[PDB]
Amino acid sequence: NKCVNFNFNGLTGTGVLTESNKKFLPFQQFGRDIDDTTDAVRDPQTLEILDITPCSFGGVSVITPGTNTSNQVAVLYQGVNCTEVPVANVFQTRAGCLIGAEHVNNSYECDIPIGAGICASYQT
Amino acid sequence: VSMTKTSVDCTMYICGDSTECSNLLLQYGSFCTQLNRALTGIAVEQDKN
C-alpha cells in the first residue's frame, strides 16, 4: 500500500503492492493479463500472492475563469484519488480529485466541463 | 454516438521512469504534445457528439 519500485526474483517493476484473493498453482510465480503485463507476483518468502497496480498517475488539468475576469484557478488530478494528490476546498469525483473549488448543491448549466456529470463555474 | 475517451502520457508510454529517455526523447520535439492535442481533441469531440 505504498508506491515502491521492486525486484522480485529478478522480475523488476513498480507500483502499489497489495494482498490478493487470487490463487496461482504451486509452479506459477508471476501473473500476466490479456495485455501480457505483469499484474501479480507470489512473494518468495511468505509464498502468497500480491496484486500490483502501477502507482497513482494521470493528467492534471487547470480550471480557469479567464485572465480578464480573475487570477483564480482550480486543479483537477485525473483518475488520481484525493488520498494521493497532496504530494503535489477539496472535492472527490468520478473524474479523480478537484482542489480549489467550492462544492455547491446548485445545479447550473456547464460553464467549464470536468467529466462524470461535473462542471465548474466562477461566481459571487 | 461516442467512443471511449483515451489519453496517453507520451513520455510514459515511450520510456517513462528512465532519465536517458527524457534526455533522448527531447531531441524529437513536439511529437508528444501533438498527440496530446490530437487525443484531448478526440475526447472533447465525444461529449460534443
Binding site: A95 | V8, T11, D47
Partner: peptide, 24 residues
C-alpha cells in the same frame, strides 16, 4: 454490449453519465 495502466495510458470519463443520458 460487452466490455490507469503501466504503459502511460488512461481512460477519461464522458461529461454525461449514463444516468444523465437516461434523463435526456
Amino acid at each position: 454490449v460487452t466490455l490507469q495502466k503501466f504503459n502511460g495510458l488512461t481512460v477519461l470519463p464522458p461529461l454525461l453519465t449514463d444516468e444523465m443520458i437516461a434523463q435526456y
